[PDB]
Amino acid sequence: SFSGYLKLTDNVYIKNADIVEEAKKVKPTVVVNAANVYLKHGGGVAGALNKATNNAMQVESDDYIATNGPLKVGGSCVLSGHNLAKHCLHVVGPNVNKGEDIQLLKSAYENFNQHEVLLAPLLSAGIFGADPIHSLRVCVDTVRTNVYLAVFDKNLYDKLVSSFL
Numbered sequence: 001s002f003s004g005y006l007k008l009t010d011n012v013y014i015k016n017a018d019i020v021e022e023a024k025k026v027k028p029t030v031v032v033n034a035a036n037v038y039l040k041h042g043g044g045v046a047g048a049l050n051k052a053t054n055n056a057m058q059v060e061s062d063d064y065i066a067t068n069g070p071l072k073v074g075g076s077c078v079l080s081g082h083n084l085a086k087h088c089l090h091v092v093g094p095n096v097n098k099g100e101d102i103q104l105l106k107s108a109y110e111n112f113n114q115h116e117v118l119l120a121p122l123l124s125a126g127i128f129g130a131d132p133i134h135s136l137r138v139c140v141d142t143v144r145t146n147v148y149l150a151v152f153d154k155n156l157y158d159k160l161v162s163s164f165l
């Protein structure tokens, strides 16, 4: 199972870890991807997860988009987890660098409540431009299921734990 996580609340855990490495080690039921509406996994968590699947995640995603059209900001879809997990929950947090409404971050985290346990990144953090401290607060106040957060950056991990209310 998950190891070395610090407990923040009843159901939220956090670790300074690369989510690709965590996924390859744990092989969780669900790994969350920090997706965009097009499921174009170019950079950040999405680029890293997709590269770990040898681009199979992108091939599957393009077929999903060809059939269904784009996701909504705040929405999600369940696809295969390939070599990383049983499933990948592609969740679209608002990209504040693209002027998307930050109020959609709570709607994005609500997708996690459909899964009993998830390995996840902080939504809208990193290249999505939101304040990761705010993302963690929305996570703890929205998600009721067991979420294991992998925070790639050590310095941000330390800041998140030390400032956690």
Ligand SMILES: CNC(=O)C1C=CC(=O)N=C1
Pocket: 017, 018, 019, 020, 044, 045, 048, 120, 121, 122, 126, 150, 151, 152
């Ligand atoms: C939770 N984030 C991560 O673990 C990342 C993010 C970007 C990346 O390139 N690789 C891993």
